[PDB]
Design a protein around this ligand. Structure first.
Ligand code: MG
Ligand code: MG
Ligand code: MG
Ligand code: MG
Ligand code: MG
Ligand code: MG
Ligand code: MG
Ligand code: MG
Ligand code: MG
Ligand code: MG
Lengths: 185, 126, 57, 141
RNA sequence: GGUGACCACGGGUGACGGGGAAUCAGGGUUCGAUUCCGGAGAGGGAGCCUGAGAAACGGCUACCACAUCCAAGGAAGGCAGCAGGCGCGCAAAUUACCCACUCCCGACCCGGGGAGGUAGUGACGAAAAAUAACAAUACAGGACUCUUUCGAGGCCCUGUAAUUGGAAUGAGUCCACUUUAAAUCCUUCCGCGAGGAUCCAUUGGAGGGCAAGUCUGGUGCCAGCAGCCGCGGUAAUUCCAGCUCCAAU
């Protein structure tokens, strides 16, 4: 009987036509263009978008002025603006459909490390984020693919507790300092 | 110097004879805090002596900037040795329990049925 | 019919060779950088009638 | 043509019912035979004892000797030929040695050459040919 | 008299019934022994006490079917509770710790609970995600600018190397703390802990379907390859090898 959770479900879908070339030759760009961990990491975002677009498309079959459409719609749109994809109150649904992967990539943390100077080359970003150098707001974030809420864009910054940012120069500079004090001095 | 213990969600539990709230320990690069210090620093806080404060919970989260948890305060040690569970009194040298250890109990108590009611043999025991 | 003597004739007499060693190949995500880089942005020269990514000169 | 009517849900169901005992792929699956016939009693692989090593002559267009094993399965006592895949591996397997034999991929069809051999050897004395023919795990003794 | 091709009656099931699952343009198709609900059985049947409440199996009564000790007169046997073993088997965990959580029974705040929780085993499976980054060189290049071109200024670049170079970090290890019940695990952190020859990514492939070499060795209708199409008979794009590449990783 036990306590425990289950409800574990995949975050992704693998492609059917297993190596088209054309599909590979897109999905590689995406990996370089933005320094992605792996191929899957695309078809994560690929799977997540296809949800949205099918959620949206689910609504486009309904008649207008119907309690669901209006509610689920706003909720859904807000959720996109909230993370900074639809803009300004573009917020009327049909539009959702016209939208591509590039977007839920551009709002990953990794990208918005060098987009806001901070890093210096896209892979620094993914290193720097893993290396527990950068923080958001107050939490120190470990994860590259944390989609950044639009609000929480200006609060990405070098952690208070890291070498660049301040305090405790890392062990490499601490050792090559102690080589000058202990070894040389 | 840098700890700053701020509390949340204080309740005056008339009927368990207590004050109880979420401890929110800030702490910078220095690592966790022990429950002894936190008791003594929460003692002068509400002015009840360290003696009558029981703390568990304490869960830190990334960066090491902050650690939440639950602590709480009875109006006399006499009540604390009454409302409080064993583990929290035994946490610091005030009340301990036997070390028979579970399968010694079970092996014994499944005997003493074998014997009838001659106390001498039940006292025979293991 | 058939002689089962000839099981493992060929692996048997093929002269073995050393597998060498140079470069601990870069892996994970850096591999994929090296990959794109070396057939997208970098070289992308004047076309020479299709490529040959593992072909000869 | 078709029956098409509106209180015809049965003539239809019962039509599309029997006109499956004319499907081939279901009359394997739903009849009985298969479970009764395949030495592999509905089971992915099976263990059996190597009772001798037999070369099989491949089907005309490709001349060669295929190097298989007569097996007797434990669960049934049903006999088998299993082609020991990959070069010089028959050399490994000795008589009376316990092998884990799996299918070929055609599920009943014999594969390509190897006329009438559904099964392929995988393991040998708890080893796995893949480890032996790579030279990773040696023969046990 | 009642039922019947609106298919009864008969037979079968790799059938405990639902709630759901993976699949899926819409429609289905198979699976649901699977923690939630409902049913049944404690080797098999029958009968039993007792009980509100049971035809109760951690009761007993035989029988049948199993099986233990023996002083040979007799006696005690029921894991489809938890652990464990044997057999079966393609095919599945530790004689672990505990009532601290949720709950229950009791005369009961107080005992007990293999119900249950906690550890261990655990590529059943799902999530996140390291396996390096960067400056300057040496270069290897290619959009501005400059040059008829050759050349050069350089904002752009990128390839390999020298690793030139220090910076950054974690896998480890381990002061310390939390955790918890006591741990453990996690989260916190003192201290140590990266120049590859390391702290070392593998599995299949490389004719096509199908992304990837008529590169180089060896065999020569053998060995062997090949899910299908096929290759192998003396330059194999096909076998065994070497180097290179590709897919996922
Ligand atoms: Mg049967
Ligand atoms: Mg039994
Ligand atoms: Mg019953
Ligand atoms: Mg009974
Ligand atoms: Mg029992
Ligand atoms: Mg299994
Ligand atoms: Mg349990
Ligand atoms: Mg997984
Ligand atoms: Mg590694
Ligand atoms: Mg192919």
């Amino acid at each position: 009987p036990v306590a425990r959770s289950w409800v574990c479900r995949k975050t992704y879908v693998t492609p059917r036509r297993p190596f088209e070339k054309s599909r590979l030759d897109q999905e590689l760009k995406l990996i370089g263009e933005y320094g992605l961990r792996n191929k899957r990491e695309v078809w994560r975002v690929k799977f997540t978008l296809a949800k949205i677009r099918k959620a949206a498309r689910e609504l486009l079959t309904l008649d207008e002025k119907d309690p669901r459409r209006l509610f689920e719609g706003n909720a859904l749109l807000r959720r996109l603006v909230r993370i900074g994809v639809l803009d300004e109150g573009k917020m009327k649904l049909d539009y959702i459909l016209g939208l591509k992967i590039e977007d839920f990539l551009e709002r990953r943390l990794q990208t918005q490390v060098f987009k806001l100077g901070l890093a210096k080359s896209i892979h620094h970003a993914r290193v720097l984020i893993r290396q527990r150098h950068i923080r958001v707001r107050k939490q120190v974030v470990n994860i590259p693919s944390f989609i950044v809420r639009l609000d929480s864009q200006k609060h990405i910054d070098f952690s208070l507790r890291s070498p660049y940012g301040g305090g405790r120069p890392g062990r490499v500079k601490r050792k090559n300092a102690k080589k000058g004090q202990g070894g040389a001095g | 110097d840098t700890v700053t213990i701020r509390t949340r969600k204080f309740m005056t539990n008339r009927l368990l004879q207590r004050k109880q709230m979420v401890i929110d320990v800030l702490h910078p690069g220095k690592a966790t805090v022990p429950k002894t210090e936190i008791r003594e620093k929460l003692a002068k806080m509400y002015k009840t002596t360290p003696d009558v404060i029981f703390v568990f919970g304490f869960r830190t989260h990334f960066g090491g900037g902050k650690t939440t948890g639950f602590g709480m305060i009875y109006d006399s040690l006499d009540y604390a040795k009454k409302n409080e569970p064993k583990h929290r009194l035994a946490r610091h040298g005030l009340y301990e329990k036997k070390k028979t250890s579970r399968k010694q109990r079970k092996e014994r108590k499944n005997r003493m049925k074998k014997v009838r009611g001659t106390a001498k043999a039940n006292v025979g025991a293991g | 019919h058939g002689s089962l003597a000839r099981a493992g004739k060929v692996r048997g007499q093929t002269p073995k060779v050393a597998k060498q060693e140079k470069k601990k190949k870069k892996t994970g995500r850096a591999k994929r950088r090296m990959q794109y880089n070396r057939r997208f942005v970098n070289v992308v020269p004047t076309f020479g009638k299709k490529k040959g990514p593992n072909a000869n000169s | 043509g078709k029956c098409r009517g509106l209180r015809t849900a049965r003539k239809l169901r019962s039509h599309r019912r029997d006109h499956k005992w004319h499907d081939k792929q279901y009359k394997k699956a739903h009849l009985g035979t298969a479970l009764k016939a395949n030495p592999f009693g509905g089971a992915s692989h099976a263990k059996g004892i190597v009772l001798e090593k037999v070369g099989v002559e491949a089907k005309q267009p490709n001349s060669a000797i295929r190097k298989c094993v007569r097996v007797q399965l434990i669960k049934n006592g049903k006999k088998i030929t299993a082609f020991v895949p990959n070069d010089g591996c028959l050399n490994f397997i000795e008589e009376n040695d316990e092998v884990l034999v799996a299918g070929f991929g055609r599920k009943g069809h014999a594969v390509g050459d190897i006329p009438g051999v559904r099964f392929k050897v995988v393991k040998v004395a708890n080893v796995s040919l893949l480890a032996l023919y790579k030279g990773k795990k040696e023969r046990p003794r």
